[PDB]
Amino acid sequence: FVNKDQIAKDVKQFYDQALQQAVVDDDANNAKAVVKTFHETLDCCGSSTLTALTTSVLKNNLCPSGSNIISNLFKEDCHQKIDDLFSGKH
Amino acid sequence: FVNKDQIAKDVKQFYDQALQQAVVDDDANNAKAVVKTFHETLDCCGSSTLTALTTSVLKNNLCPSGSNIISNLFKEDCHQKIDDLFSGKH
């Protein structure tokens, strides 16, 4: 068995760490490539509306190839889209 | 540092489980839904492991097309895609 709520938290935490590492002392490319991948796949750019916004302003590269800024204001954030994926509500 | 491998292993299992469930419609429990989402989000259909379960879902229209070569011609499996998500690959 595998717990649905639990595994959403696991993935969510996992993305947080990489976002957190990808935004600071970059040069990683690693946490940066997982962040870009998470962002293109789930169509989001922050653990929250605030961080997505921020991120789009300070580090646009990490956001979906064609996302914008304003959009990040209204479009769901990665944490929502992760829950959506685990409850098959996409 | 929630373990990348370990998380990736759990998401595989979680997908397998939804998989072992969208086959028996009886209270589909969005198991079908969960499957469909993973399939559209990660762009995959089933696993090389689990060939039977795969044949079943594909036949039950849980791996929709809409293109050409992937469009249900050359699948790509969810365990690989999931691995790719957690490694910032594709």
Could you tell me the residue ranges of all domains in chain A?
Answer: 1-90
B23, two tokens: 């086959």
Residues of A in contact with B90 (CB under 8 A): 37
> B18 CB near a chain A CB, below 8 Å?
yes
Contact A8, A78 (CB under 8 A): no
B82, two tokens: 């999931």
Contacts of A7 (CB under 8 A, 6+ apart): A86, B7, B10, B11, B14
CB contact under 8 A, A37 and B7: no
Tell me how far the alpha carbon of residue A77 is from its chain's centroid.
Answer: 7
Q: Helices B4-22 and B51-59 meet at what angle, rounded to 10?
A: 50
Closest alpha carbon within chain B to A34:
B88
In CATH, what number does B1-90 get? Answer: 1.10.1450.10
Name the residue among A13, A17, A22, A74 with its Cα closest to residue A43. A74
Q: What is the DSSP letter of A61?
A: G
Give this entry's resolution in angstroms.
2.6
CB contact under 8 A, A88 and B38: yes
State the Cα–Cα distance between residues B3 and A30, nearest whole angstrom. Answer: 15
Contact A53, A72 (CB under 8 A): yes
State the Cα–Cα distance between residues A52 and B28, nearest whole angstrom. Answer: 35
From residue B29, how far is each of B21, B22, B26 by CA, in Å? Answer: 8, 8, 8
